[PDB]
Symmetry: D3
Subunit: 334 residues, 6 copies
């Protein structure tokens, strides 16, 4: 409870734009979402995506059962109308009386990017950004947004699953395992602008990771001397202490083939991981877990996370340094 609080300073995806537009016949929302156990409502007021606590100030009805009416969100119960800043500007029963000062609900940072809606619950440290998706605005690439998949596992466990290759022989023997390259060498890892960066070579191929902390992964797969660029972007929304809503976007240079060739393969990979990751208990990794040399990526990830957690208690400047100070191990220049 105390230990998840620093996660409120990051931007997290809560839904696709498609899900918001399908939520209500108007295509404007409202849509109820949950983030870090907070009940929120998302709507499009004018040209602005807005996110508020899903709870009217008057008698606590859920705004997510209400209606968007121009530049206002209208509560279903007695019709109070809230503006983009969460302040009531119309009490229909008392339309000439002054509106109480307390007639306001909490409003949160809310922004569309890459076809997802992102929410940042706490902006007080002013140093976090929506994660990096390298394929955005690259006209060589066809971009496809998959439907979200829900797992009974935490965002940390899902991240460590995504960036590990030790498990291919046992979970993915027919899909991702390469029998002639069964053990990946330890690779150098760099911290730069709040991202982990690391690259694996075959050099016939290349797996280039840019991971915006804490839960987003951008993987570029290129074949050298060939035009086979494939990008996977995966980000987990920490819905509550046990549950993730996960988003996978993929982009590809060679787009003459079917989208569903890649979707079916990706779904097979996910279905192989899913029961094993859901079995991990307790849901958060305890201090007694035993690491080996091949676990470099997750060891370093856990190391960074607890630095961020300690820096959050020390305040805005400690946190900004912990997040954004470079730490270079490789030969690359940034």
């Amino acid at each position: 409870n105390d230990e998840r609080e620093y996660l409120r300073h990051f931007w997290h995806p809560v839904c696709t734009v498609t899900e918001l537009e399908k939520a209500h016949p108007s295509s404007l929302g409202p849509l109820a979402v949950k983030l870090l156990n907070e009940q929120l409502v998302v709507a499009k007021l004018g040209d602005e995506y807005v996110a508020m606590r899903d709870r009217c100030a008057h008698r606590s009805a859920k705004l997510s059962l209400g209606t968007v009416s121009g530049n206002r969100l209208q509560c279903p119960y007695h019709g109070w109308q809230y503006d983009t800043h969460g302040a009531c500007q119309l009490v229909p029963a008392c339309p000439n009386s002054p509106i109480p000062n307390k007639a306001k609900v909490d409003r949160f940072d809310c922004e569309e990017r890459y076809g997802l809606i992102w929410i940042r619950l706490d902006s007080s440290f002013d140093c976090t950004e929506i994660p990096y998706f390298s394929a955005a605005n690259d006209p060589r690439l066809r971009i496809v947004i998959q439907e979200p998949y829900w797992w009974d596992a935490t965002a940390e466990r899902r991240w460590e699953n995504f960036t590990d290759f030790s498990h291919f022989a046992f979970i993915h023997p027919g899909t991702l395992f390469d029998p002639n390259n069964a053990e990946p060498p330890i690779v150098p890892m760099d911290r730069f602008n709040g991202q982990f960066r690391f690259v694996y070579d075959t050099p016939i191929g290349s797996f280039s990771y840019t991971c915006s902390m804490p839960f987003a992964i951008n993987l570029e797969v290129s074949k050298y001397s060939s035009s086979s660029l494939h990008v996977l972007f995966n980000v987990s929304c920490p819905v509550d202490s046990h549950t993730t809503k996960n988003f996978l976007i993929f982009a590809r240079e060679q787009s003459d083939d079917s989208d569903y060739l890649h979707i079916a393969f990706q779904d097979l990979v996910l279905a192989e991981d899913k029961p094993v990751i859901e079995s991990q208990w307790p849901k958060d990794a305890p201090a007694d877990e035993v690491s080996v040399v091949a676990d470099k990526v997750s060891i370093q990830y856990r190391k960074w996370l607890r630095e961020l957690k300690e820096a959050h208690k020390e305040g805005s400047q400690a946190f900004r340094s912990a997040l954004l100070d470079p730490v270079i191990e490789s030969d690359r220049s940034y």
Copy 2:
């Protein structure tokens, strides 16, 4: 539960007579019911309706899985027989041994009225009565008891919903909303014999409310110089901290039409209310809720409940004064 102890002193409805008769083929019960989170069992023993704790004194089996045999409720496990006062009168395994003095279960006030079964858990203040239903013993009126309806909402929030008119335009636009009277004014409210009394007029008819504290509403709808008296009697059973079992009885002078004309309209109104009331959270009204002048009825209701809660803690005489002292705002003379 500390905060709802004072509710144990009121009469609460727990089932209809029909539900009790239908529970078991005997037609005498037993029927399990829950009131203020207490598990009770109701039965008809001889000519009397009885309510007991649903827990055998011997080995704690549910008496509600037992059998009514004349004027005994027989436990299903070892067949101990309990009389109308909750005292065991037969131990079948030791039929000539004396029955231990501890072989009794708590027995509560239990009375039929208007075709409902009513239970008062604590009679020690001796100053509460079954709520007032004005159509009873009026031979001009046909009386119908609807089937009970369960809501995931508290009795307080249900009462506030029933007595509010600000919500009609938004929840009931095509059923109850009157655009010829879109904002009923604030009215005088009287306290008299433990009831709230208040009337709303046309601007030719009237809505006359007699509300027996804490959870019953008697509403007489008249149209002037017509034989068109309609009466709605609604009462919420506070089952536990998040649930109500609700009862609606209605009476009408004009009785040549179908009962189901009124039931289907009343059910449609209830269905419009239900999702919004059940969305309200937290279940009990917290202090941060924001009232406006049009909430007079709700504000005064919350105030009286607070007074009853405080007076209960001060004892029998304080509670009795808080409940039955008259407080008149209108020009009426009772």
Copy 3:
């Protein structure tokens, strides 16, 4: 709560051998089980039945989703292999590096007996044994292991239901109730070798002899003289958590030319009659306000003994062993 602590010192059944062999196509397990709210995994590793915590030391995946390979249990995630002592012997990703010292999981005493798998979670007092079943190794008897049955009731309440007959007229009027024998009298009860022993004679030429291995096992021998028709029932509850039991019934009979299903149907009917009443008892553990009568002697004596065991366990190994194994005889019988 902490009042269950002393129960970890006994052997409890967790599954049938059949359940273990059906769990996984290899017929070696693994199988997940739960005992006193502990999540365990059972597998057949070589010629041994082994019980471990169902949690890999590396990244906490469930070993019960993995595979037996040779004499080892292999985790489904990164393939660490654990031996019969719970120690990791292979890290596939680092096959030449040294295996970390803490690469191990807790292991528990585990044994097959009578076609059930038994686990003891705490062996430090070392004074308890697997319950007694009188029919094993008796070639006159056909033995049948029933499918386990799950009840939303504690093991103590289940034991008291099995040993009571006050309830026959009301729960079993058409199955077990005998109208010409409605009141079995109170009988002497012996403590011996950590068992309750007590015998009901028929005055109708028979006998019901109970040997109840504390805390949750019951061996009932029925003799219908003067006939060669011995019938043995063996019932034991696994305390799965604070609310739930997984129950095992094994029955044996001398006259075994009739159908097994004649007996299984009858027993299943008896169990179905008991089930809703026992599951309705609340709260789940019997509080101090229950009102006993003279006919409840067996139940009263059972609760007194569990209370002694629970108090002796707080005073340590030697006190517990005396409470469990000291004899207390009140019948006229030899031992």
Copy 4:
């Protein structure tokens, strides 16, 4: 269907008044019903209960999905309005054009009696009446209408089951079987005004049957020198070749007890019969069935049905004689 044409001349119950009122929020219907495999729609238009074919004349939509508006049944597709005689009186698309003469649907006799809706599909023989229920207009008796019960069995097999006593020891050992009277003797049976009449005595009471052909049974149970008259009225609606919708009405002098005491006992009796009657196959009694002397009631029933079937084919006068000619076996004088 060739063999059941003669049944169209009788009055058959299709629903209770309650079912009709509950079908749609209007309380006026429409309700879809099926009789002798004909799809019909029932509605209350003005003061009249009407039955029509459930098939609009225009484009064959189901009128049962439409709306009752006063004294019109409105088709849901293009809104044609049908009056109480089945004639279209408004074509909304051509409101001043004349309505084609073919714009009518077949309309059938439809009458309320005893709280049931009754339909006679063919009135051309003008010699059949709604079955006799002896307790109607007896002010000493409380009358209760049970909910209808559907069986996968024909109306003939249901009737034979209700009037047989040979089965009590085997289907009803603990409910109806009397070991003090284990084999009721064969009795005289009378034909009178289209009814079978027969009485069984004690060896102090009597079972007096008045059976209006073909599917109704009126059973008066008396105990001598007591005010204990019980009446059961049972009638099967022949829905199609393998299904009945059955109606049970019961009346009683002693009315201080619960209606549900009797309903639950009557429902238990029905539940004992149901699986055996539904197992009978083929659904219609073939010629190879083997009767014994104790089947007198069933044998004479089958004979009268055969005569009615033959007489129908010979025409109105033959059918009327076959139905209403008296055939007396008893010493009674009607």
Copy 5:
């Protein structure tokens, strides 16, 4: 019955391209479909969409449970491989023996157009084409293919529902009904190139222009002048069997900066309003006793033309082609 026979001569849609690619992880199919009670399989074999009878010639297994291998459809049972003409080219069990002459399955004309797969079961008259969709290859329009919807109603009854407006006040009172325009008058109807053409003007400055490719396809263009807000709806029913249609809706719009889901929700609501009424019509095919009024001209003309086609088909190829393609003009318009 045999009254459906003439329908085999037209092109009918059977699935979306999306449905075909999702069917099997290879994204090449195969996918089982049903058209006029024929069980077919569709697969992408090389650069061609191919339709065959979904029944192997060897032992009658369903090819739709098999696999595309190269440019061939391989049966799941014994692995016979069929080419784009339905001829077996490999018998894995007898790889050197000659392949039996009758080792082949029926194949059918199959083409992609507008993102749907179309099949013609009988090509012997060779005079029908794939229906016309006015929005294809118009770069001013955003085109959206909806998910197919299944109704328990025939394709003829579905077509008459789509082209009627008599029903708006009663089925669509809050969606399509216009209170200031409740009675669209009767309009002239043209037959041209096997299409019905007819146009409704607004006296409210608009236009509804129908091009209906017989028998079951409807292209509706809506112009809301004087604005650049052209909207095109294209609806076509697949007659799956005597009782059932699988329906495809494609819509196109010029103003495409709003959400696709604004339009999809509205259209889905319209369809949900129609569905129970249309499915309630009985019997499934309209009998001779239905009573028409003057407002039903479109429906009356539609049924007359289908009757001609059905009669011309019994007289052969040349008669059918004239019935389908002869012009019959009653408007004042150019063609």
Copy 6:
């Protein structure tokens, strides 16, 4: 319909003995079964297994809802009692009157063998036997009876699936396919005593088939010079024209391992075959199916079946010759 009639002359399994004993608490049945679209009832009367048409002669109730009472099967409706020959010997309602000659139901050959109940519907040709299971009464072998498995496929199609190896590469690539012996040679097949016999060698191993016509297969798998005998016995009950209830028995010499090792493997094999065989249509193999040289077994099977079918029309002696005349292709001596 006409074409399945010759199948009534063979013995077919309808249930396990276990299923019969579990059907009713008595362990004696009755159990309803279906064979070649006939509704039958099976019960144990004394020491005899009996099979009758599931239809009482009196009023056609199902005897399978009745009760075994010593040496009688008692109908649930009016309690008629049938003896082991299907003749009613007690009419409870008329216990002294002569029982009608027609009071009899059809009785069929019924016999236990190998833990299954077999029924022969037509014994008129007197030349068929219960199929051969080679492991019965071999004390070296542990015998296990699996639970029956139901397929939506005919008995002929299931038989041809069981005796074919062409399909291993495609249906069983991981279970039964042997990559170094991918094409089995054509083998000689012998007809002897109504069995097909044929043997496949590896000679390190051996698959020896004895197939009692028409639906039973006995497969002995032995490794030469080793004691690895494994027997599979599979027989299909032709329940109706589209459905089989299939029985698998297996026996093994090495029985120190778990029964469920073999059961799990066998279930995996069956689950691989099942969707492909259920897809075959039409359900019976038409004349247009195209065979290749590798289909010898099924070609010869289809050849024998149509010989039996033609011989059935020519009568008892033609059929006996067609079934039991030897036709030897191999070197073996019988």
